[PDB]
């Protein structure tokens, strides 16, 4: 695999949240999607532009303790500081003991681990999280990828009942990365669509016995993903996605997957 | 598959509850079990007999936004009104991009989406939910199917400490459909029995790596199901199922799977004293 | 499989705690690891040394109602009493009707069912729980097995911020059994290591579609386990494991997997 390099900056946002960006002044919440193929190495030249200590910690991928992003492993970044974090990945294969070593591929995420507390409770609450996809050779690639983060009671830190909404055309392969943070369990639900509860969100064939679900319980720092064919068997329309914990949806943990016809039109709907 | 048609009614029930039924005055909580084979279409002629808008939304099955049963899609039903919902299903198959399209088969459920709030919070609380099983060709069919709904701190909206209990005889192939609703997470456990955490609850063969469990965390709107051979390897008796969150079980989220010997009896079952 | 016999005791410990042990005065929380192979039968001669009734209930394994360990099935133990519980286990196989019967193998656990309430709420809170592993023929055996119990907001009933920590050398095959109890859901997370969300925690080979995770939601009475190669592709170090529920990790539900180089050293850490 490739040796890759990116720049990342942690920035306080003008509304007082915090976010990672590929350029100065271009921070988003969630942070930018990082995509790698198993075997790729990624060196992230990270700069903490804030006036508090901040770090970068990744789930699932291979890193040494010097890229833990923790105070425990002396690998957080002082205010205005820089640090190069290195993520590695490996393909699956047979160990000499006969057992099978699981590859890095999966739907993963990165987050701050020092803002607020030694577990990143404040950086997480403020926005310092983002998605990482590690692909296996042969994995099917999508038309679009959309990241949905249930961070305490907000989606992608948006106010109640304020999306995000994602648009697609009927028939598109659409990938969703679904990450959870904070204090609460949630249940992720999409109307109109369903996926397999396995690595890729898709059944490998008729012999794959994976649960096919449209609703999935998640807790802080869980991540999974899937791909659907937009509107498959169900048509164009505004397909809600939402936490299914009753008060959480009532409180605004709801967005719309807007699946349009190939003429760009959608059946009329009446949003909040 | 085949085109099927049923009538369904939503009605108020005593004590502030609401339910679906196949005929007026026969609503139940949970609502009627709907069972389809992959490829079947079901048209439900739904009548809302209540004085507030109500709907039917289903998980897992195929439906267009005109049968979403949501305010968003203007597909709920006014007081006294009727609407025909359509649920479709499909078998799995290979797509022209080379991927495998997952079939409709599974343990699913339907519920109201507009009573109380535009997420049906009031209607689900009150009893407007029921089970839907879609079978795949070749699926093994059970001797009996029992539905267990954890709705907040109640089972099937029954008073705390009131079951339900289900009976079977050793060797029967008993299916359970387990649905959760409301605000709380739970952990569903059964004494003496275990199942696979996969589509059918049964391992497919020696090649199926699915987890074998007797305890499963669930949250609002999760549904799963399984079949067990009653008493297999463990014999007759009163086998508890309960939520394993400790205060939940202590507050009464418990029921009995009552497994009889083939002679009719349940060991240890002594409801009555004896002289002497 | 073989017939095995053991003794087990329930005792009070300090601080109003209660524990199971394989010898008097040797109760521990979690209780002793019990390991069987599918087919084995285990007869446990259990003595309740305490002054309240107590019992032994197990998840996963085959038992008759006489060993349910509940008041419902008249199988708890009077103060100072003794009872022999029997656990059986079976291999997987095909039924006469061609359906596949799942085996007893997995990562399971035993606990009291009558202390405090008829669901063992106080017995669990106070420490009456432990791990059982049932192995399948051909399963790989580890170098060490560590048990991590999330019991409400404590790990293994230990005070906040007091581990437990577990040590290995780079390359050791280390097995974890993770059991949760009480009132709360948690998410179990381990730095620098991952596992398959299936029975063994290891993929069966190139066809097994199980998700590979490093973070897993669990609730009361859930149990799972896995093996890793310590430090694989990431090296020696102080690798945290913790609940990832943010207040729970802030309140001290954290431990270290201390993975040492072969010369016994470990990159300097800041606990
Ligand atoms: Cu961490
Ligand atoms: Cu939620
Ligand atoms: Cu994390
Ligand atoms: Cu909905
Ligand atoms: Cu519960
Ligand atoms: Cu729903
Ligand atoms: Cu129990
Ligand atoms: Cu926790
Ligand atoms: Cu239990």
UniProtKB/TrEMBL annotation, chain B:
One of its GO terms (molecular function) is oxidoreductase activity. Residues 28-137, 156-261 form the Plastocyanin-like domain. Cu(2+) 3 binds at residues 113, 191, 242. The keyword Oxidoreductase applies. Cu(2+) 5 binds at residues 189, 191, 242. GO terms for biological process: iron ion transport. Cu(2+) 2 binds at residues 57, 189. Cu(2+) 1 binds at residues 57, 59, 111, 244. Keywords: Metal-binding, Oxidoreductase. GO terms for cellular component: plasma membrane. Cu(2+) 4 binds at residues 186, 243, 248. Cu(2+) 6 binds at residue 270. The keyword Oxidoreductase applies. This is Copper oxidase.
């Amino acid at each position: 695999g490739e040796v890759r390099r990116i720049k990342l900056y942690a920035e306080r946002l003008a509304d007082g949240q915090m976010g990672y960006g590929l350029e100065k002044g271009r921070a988003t919440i969630p942070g930018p999607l990082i995509e790698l193929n198993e075997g790729d190495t990624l060196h992230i030249e990270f700069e903490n532009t804030m006036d508090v200590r901040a770090s970068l910690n990744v789930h699932g991928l291979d890193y040494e303790v010097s890229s833990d992003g923790t105070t425990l492993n002396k690998s957080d970044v002082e205010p205005g500081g820089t640090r190069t974090y290195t993520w590695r990945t490996h393909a699956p294969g047979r160990r000499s003991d006969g057992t099978w070593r699981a590859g890095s591929a999966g739907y993963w995420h990165y987050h701050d681990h020092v803002v607020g507390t030694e577990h990143g409770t404040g950086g997480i609450r403020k926005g310092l999280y983002g998605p990482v996809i590690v692909r296996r050779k042969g994995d099917v690639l999508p038309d679009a990828t959309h990241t949905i983060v249930f961070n305490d009671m907000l989606i992608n830190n948006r106010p109640a009942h304020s999306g995000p909404n994602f648009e697609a055309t009927v028939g598109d392969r659409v990938e969703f990365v679904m990450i959870t943070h904070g204090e609460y369990y949630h249940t992720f639900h999409m109307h109109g669509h369903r996926w397999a509860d396995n690595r890729t969100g898709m059944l490998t064939g008729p012999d794959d016995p994976s649960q096919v679900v449209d609703n999935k319980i998640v807790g802080p720092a869980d991540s999974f993903g899937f791909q659907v064919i937009a509107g498959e068997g169900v048509g164009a329309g505004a397909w809600m996605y939402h936490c299914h914990v009753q008060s959480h949806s009532d409180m605004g943990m709801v967005g719309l997957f807007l699946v349009k016809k190939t003429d760009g039109t959608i059946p009329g709907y009446e949003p909040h």
